[PDB]
Amino acid sequence: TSVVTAENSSASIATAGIGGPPQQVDQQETWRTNFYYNDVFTWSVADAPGSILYTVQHSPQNNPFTAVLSQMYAGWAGGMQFRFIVAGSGVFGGRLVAAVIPPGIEIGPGLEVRQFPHVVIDARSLEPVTITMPDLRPNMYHPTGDPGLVPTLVLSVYNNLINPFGGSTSAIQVTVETRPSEDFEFVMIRAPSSKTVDSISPAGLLTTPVLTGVGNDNRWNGQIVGLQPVPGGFSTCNRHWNLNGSTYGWSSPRFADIDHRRGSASYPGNNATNVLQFWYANAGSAIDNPISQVAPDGFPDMSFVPFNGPGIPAAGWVGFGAIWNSNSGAPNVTTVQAYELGFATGAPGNLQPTTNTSGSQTVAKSIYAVVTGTAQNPAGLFVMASGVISTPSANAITYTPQPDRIVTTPGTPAAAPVGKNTPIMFASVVRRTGDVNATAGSANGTQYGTGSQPLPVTIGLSLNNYSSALMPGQFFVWQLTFASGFMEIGLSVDGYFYAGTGASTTLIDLTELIDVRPVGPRPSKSTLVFNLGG
Amino acid sequence: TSVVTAENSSASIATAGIGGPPQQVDQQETWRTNFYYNDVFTWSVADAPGSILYTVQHSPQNNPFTAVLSQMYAGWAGGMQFRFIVAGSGVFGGRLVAAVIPPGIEIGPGLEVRQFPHVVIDARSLEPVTITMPDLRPNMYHPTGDPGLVPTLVLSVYNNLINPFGGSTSAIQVTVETRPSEDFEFVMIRAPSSKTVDSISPAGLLTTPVLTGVGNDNRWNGQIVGLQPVPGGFSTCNRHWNLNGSTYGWSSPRFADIDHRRGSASYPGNNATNVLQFWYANAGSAIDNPISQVAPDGFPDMSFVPFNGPGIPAAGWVGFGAIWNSNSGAPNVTTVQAYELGFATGAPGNLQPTTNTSGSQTVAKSIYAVVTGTAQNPAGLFVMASGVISTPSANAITYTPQPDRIVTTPGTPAAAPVGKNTPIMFASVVRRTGDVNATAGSANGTQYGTGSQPLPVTIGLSLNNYSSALMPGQFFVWQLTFASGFMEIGLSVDGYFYAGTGASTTLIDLTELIDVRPVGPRPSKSTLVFNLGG
């Protein structure tokens, strides 16, 4: 075998002797002789000449085996060899340029990689193309924890990609591989406790059994069976956490309980027998909720539908609950019922649905008859957190909610389709009131309820800060593999999830889904693949 | 590594010793061992066999690093190595021939490159094809400033390019790369003050922040947000500067002021209360303007629309201004109003719009009521240079101007679509009179006003002479790179800008535009690319 050493090799082990004798310097060790996978990027026909497709800074992490060895060593020095395995086709054309940009030069649109010392990679190349990144460093070694100035490896489009067919295929995958060079070394062994870049990548929170096993939504605690796209956009802010340590809304991530103490109660009719109890409060009276004052913790963020009489309302959010008096509260025995909660205006007269939370008032009307009706001014509610959907007859209404019924607070980031990508929404089979036995079989299509993001993701995002873990303008992409196809699923800086379905409103079933796999950050201009089983 | 020396190598350093010892002659210097980018040309399927695609004369400039080193050296001698990296495809066919034509032979259509000593370059070649241009010179060295007779490198079509598909892709990009040969040298070090070809290429005047940042039009001082093509052609001559140091029109490039002293004034009606003041002068009475006598400096070159009564006219050019008496002028206090200016015939009776400036008369009619109306024969105007567009109601009329309303002087060069290319026109969002709050958001589409060329280009072209900087029959091409595509934009010998959209009238938005890049001269038969985001 032949392992290529760097140009600055003899002065690299010489000046890194301030760390003592070099460690893991044995050239017959396999982890130093073989190339191993590092990354995959995508080269589309929409890429301009001169545009940068791949960028990596010099670091052991670029190799899977020097990233393992760097957690026991407090320092490194030496180069790294990169290989480029274009998937390609013999009908595609266009070249790439790869050059090692020295420290002190910007990496941006104005950079002319073609006038650096470079290597050229064809779109139809069989053998992989190799370049060596030396360790052109001003520090004498890079301590793992603050490495210093490093060279950068930049792939740029030389000639733009052409496909002389037309549609269908428009992007080529290029696989980066990585081997240490002959003068790479480690110094100053440390305890494996912890160190290195002191941040967490957003990769391990979304694993395999989150979609084909356990895993729940943000609205009901239902098992995820589908992703359904929406074209045009939607907004959710209840249990939706963005990539920083913040949210815009109430409802801490737990389906426990809804409890409110102060608010008015009423019932219609002159007779206090077999009526519908109606409870109301304004927005901003929730003193007990430490996150947001606009609602009690666990209140559903849907718009109230105006219904009257004995008719069961279509769609909506009902939950089992009771009303309790204040002053060391013991609830009334003769009122426990299913209640539909929501947001209205003009209570208790002409009730209209509301879109914005400001200027709205929370309402709670019973759907079934109750033999007693109270009207005391201090009163509250106690409603379980998990809910069901009220329906007039069986059949199947629609997936609930629609994108227009979902209430938003002021200052909320909205999902927008960028390119051919479109946002998705996670579906779950939920029980209903028109048919309790809604097993997923025959007797009409079962009801689907859709939340924004998976809860495991909400729990694992709430604690950690990811302000630099994903570079804005891109999304982190996972690779779902079914039994007869595969798909790419993205995750932006706002917590939204993307798939490149385009203008389609068809539910995608995770029945035959097997495994997922991290890839990394990838820009929003690249279309996520849709090679499904169909 | 191996660097190939020339055939006339031993007699090249020998006869260039009249300059003394050779400089930058060190073969281990990287700038002499690596190939670097020089140019890109395009090989279309419309190219005949024998037709010349690429031509370069022998010069250090052909290399990015000997062009840097030539500004400190007053002389050079030796060869240069060229490489040809065809982007290609495995489905394309056809060959090229590259030969070094000696001095004293013409470079034209009758030249048979295939019977010179040549190299053959396939359309589907993976490895680059190398040729060496020796320094076959009659002078003993080439002083930078007057080099003398040089050999020329000519690429010609051997077999014409075939695509056995049909449409879509019809052109291949070929990338020229360049390395100095072993006997290249510099002599007689000079001060870096300045020298070399003593002219400026038209490349640095159109840079990145001219389109996604600062940058204004020739009609209003509005920020450029779009390019819109027109099929059929248009003519503009007001602040439109061609590639020489000349123009055909008035209005020096500055939005300062419009001031005219002599000309007649009138108002209709027997009552001198709440009338529309109307001022007129003939074409050719502007003594104060040193460029052209046909107009005052800053007068808008649009055709007057005939309107009467209290109706606000559709389209047009209005500006805020007042009338002033002569003989050490102090203006009248009781007449300051918005005025619509323009060109008419048959004033003050039957007013008709005019196309040609000869035989026309400049008119200036108020659109709003004014409590005093003068009729003195010596009177003038003072109108601000920046203008707005008068509109009856809100909505959106059209982009203004249309190609037919624009007045031309006699002797004006007209834009014509050549091939599939078509001319473009730079758009800007301008304020209107029907809606002052024309922020680019909701409440109908905002009004777009279109000028001919960017002002930075007018300022940077006015001073310098470019009579040989662009070879006629071609255009200089820049490479715009968006977030999801790219485009080629040309610039001819007449100041017009071209894009290869074809027969389309759709506005192209520079919202996602990032960077531009110079390429060079490219002929008019080559279609500029349109790989946009759609």
Distance CA(A109)–CA(A105), nearest Å, equals 12
Distance CA(A393)–CA(A391), nearest Å, equals 6
Give the sign of the dihedral formed by CA A33, CA A38, CA A44, CA A46.
Answer: negative
Q: Quickly list DSSP for B285-317.
A: ---S-SS-SSS-TT---BBPP---TTPPPSS--
Which residues of A are less than 8 Å from B90 in CB distance?
Answer: 90-91, 93, 124
Q: Quickly list DSSP for A337-373.
A: EEEEEEEEESTTSS-EE-SBSTT-EEEEEESS-BS--
Distance CA(A525)–CA(A382), nearest Å, equals 48
Task: Say whether B533 and A46 touch across the interface (CB within 8 A).
Answer: yes
Structural contact between residues B126 and A125, judged by C-beta atoms closer than 8 angstroms: yes
Structural contact between residues B161 and B45, judged by C-beta atoms closer than 8 angstroms: yes
Short-list B56, B29, B27, B24, CA closest to B40: B56
Task: Say whether A93 and B85 touch across the interface (CB within 8 A).
Answer: no
* Chain B closest-CA separation from residue A86 CA (Å): 14
> Which one of A92, A114, A158 would you mutate to disrupt binding with B, by most B Cβ within 10 Å of its Cβ?
A114
Q: What angle do CA B249, B251, B253 make, to 5 degrees?
A: 120
Q: What angle do CA B183, B185, B188 make, to 5 degrees?
A: 150
Tokens 């299913």 correspond to what residue?
Answer: A338
Task: Say whether B85 and A158 touch across the interface (CB within 8 A).
Answer: yes
Q: How many whole angstroms from its chain centre is CA B348?
A: 40
Ranges of H-type helices in A307-448: none
> Which one of B45, B178, B479, B531 would you mutate to disrupt binding with A, by most A Cβ within 10 Å of its Cβ?
B531
Short-list B367, B343, B332, CA closest to B281: B343
DSSP 8-state assignment for residue A415: P
Q: How many whole angstroms from its chain centre is CA B191?
A: 33
Short-list A378, A385, A409, CA closest to A291: A409
> Chain A to chain B, count of Cβ pairs less than 8 Å apart?
100
SS (H, E, C) B202-238: CCCCCCHHHCCCCCCCCCCCCCEEEEEECCCCCCCCC
Task: Say whether A48 and B89 touch across the interface (CB within 8 A).
Answer: no
Of B165, B531, B533, the CB nearest to A160: B531
Q: What angle do CA A376, A382, A386 make, to 5 degrees?
A: 145
Distance CA(A344)–CA(A349), nearest Å, equals 11
Bridge partner residues of A364 (DSSP): A279, A341
Task: Say whether B87 and A114 touch across the interface (CB within 8 A).
Answer: no
Distance CA(A453)–CA(A448), nearest Å, equals 15
Element (H, E) at A335: strand A331-345
Residues in chain B: 534
Distance CA(B439)–CA(B51), nearest Å, equals 53
Write out the two tokens for A524.
């929003």
Write out the two tokens for B132.
């060496």
Distance CA(B321)–CA(B382), nearest Å, equals 6
DSSP 8-state assignment for residue B462: H
Nearest CA in chain A to B514: A109
Distance CA(B477)–CA(B456), nearest Å, equals 17
Burial of B109 (0-12, 13-18, 19+ CB in 10 A): exposed
Q: How was this structure determined?
A: cryo-EM
Which residues of B are less than 8 Å from A158 in CB distance?
Answer: 85, 87, 175
Distance CA(A172)–CA(A88), nearest Å, equals 6
Q: Biggest alpha carbon distance in chain A?
A: 98
* Chain B closest-CA separation from residue A376 CA (Å): 47
Distance CA(A301)–CA(A289), nearest Å, equals 16
Residues in chain A: 534
Which residues of B are less than 8 Å from A49 in CB distance?
Answer: 40, 173, 479, 481, 486, 517
Distance CA(A307)–CA(A391), nearest Å, equals 12
Structural contact between residues B113 and B102, judged by C-beta atoms closer than 8 angstroms: no
What's the CA dihedral at B272, B276, B277, B280 to 10 degrees? -130
The answer to whether the peptide bond before residue B401 is cis (omega within 30 degrees of 0) is yes
Question: C-alpha distances in angstroms, A526 versus A11, B460, B484?
Answer: 42, 38, 8
Interface of A with B (CB under 8 A): 45-51, 90-95, 109-110, 112, 114-118, 120, 122, 124-125, 158-160, 162-166, 419, 525
B455 three-class SS? helix
Distance CA(A534)–CA(A531), nearest Å, equals 8
Structural contact between residues B125 and B88, judged by C-beta atoms closer than 8 angstroms: yes
The answer to whether the peptide bond before residue A401 is cis (omega within 30 degrees of 0) is yes
Tokens 């941006």 correspond to what residue?
Answer: A108
Distance CA(A44)–CA(B258), nearest Å, equals 52
Give the sign of the dihedral formed by CA B124, CA B128, CA B133, CA B134.
Answer: negative
Write out the two tokens for B22.
């050779």
* Chain B closest-CA separation from residue A140 CA (Å): 24
Distance CA(A306)–CA(B177), nearest Å, equals 73
Contacts of B486 (CB under 8 A, 6+ apart): A46, A47, A48, A49, A51, A160, B479, B480, B529, B531
Nearest CA in chain B to A127: B126
Of B37, B64, B87, the CB nearest to A93: B87
Structural contact between residues A459 and A504, judged by C-beta atoms closer than 8 angstroms: no
| Terminal alpha carbon distance of chain B | 46
Of B87, B483, B515, the CB nearest to A525: B483
Nearest CA in chain B to A474: B483
Distance CA(B228)–CA(B235), nearest Å, equals 15
Structural contact between residues A411 and A492, judged by C-beta atoms closer than 8 angstroms: no
Distance CA(A118)–CA(B30), nearest Å, equals 12
Contacts of A417 (CB under 8 A, 6+ apart): A231, A232, A233, A423
Give the neighbor-by-neighbor strand order of the sheet with B80-86.
Answer: B36-44, B171-180, B80-86, B129-133
Nearest CA in chain A to B519: A49
Distance CA(B430)–CA(B424), nearest Å, equals 19
Write out the two tokens for B341.
């200016």
Interface of B with A (CB under 8 A): 30, 34, 36-37, 40, 64, 85, 87-92, 126, 128, 163, 165, 167-169, 172-173, 175, 208, 479-486, 514-515, 517, 529, 531, 533
Q: Quickly list DSSP for B88-110.
A: --TT-B-EEEEEEEPTTS--STT
Judging by DSSP bridges, how do beta strands A486-491 and A474-481 pair with one another? Answer: antiparallel
Short-list A311, A341, A327, A326, CA closest to A374: A326
Spell out a b/e string for A71-110, using b for 16 or more CB atoms within 10 Å of the CB, else e. Answer: bbbbbbbbbbbbbbbbebbebbbbbbbbbbbeeeeeeeee
Structural contact between residues B97 and B54, judged by C-beta atoms closer than 8 angstroms: no
Short-list A110, A80, A82, A86, CA closest to A98: A82
Check chain B for breaks (C–N over 2.5 Å) and list the residue before each, or none.
none
Which residues of A are less than 8 Å from B479 in CB distance?
Answer: 48-50
Half-sphere exposure of B498 (CA within 13 A, CB side): 29
Burial of B532 (0-12, 13-18, 19+ CB in 10 A): middle
Burial of B353 (0-12, 13-18, 19+ CB in 10 A): middle
B473 three-class SS? coil
Short-list B59, B58, B240, CA closest to B152: B58
Question: C-alpha distances in angstroms, B139 versus B8, B92, B181, B183?
Answer: 14, 43, 19, 16
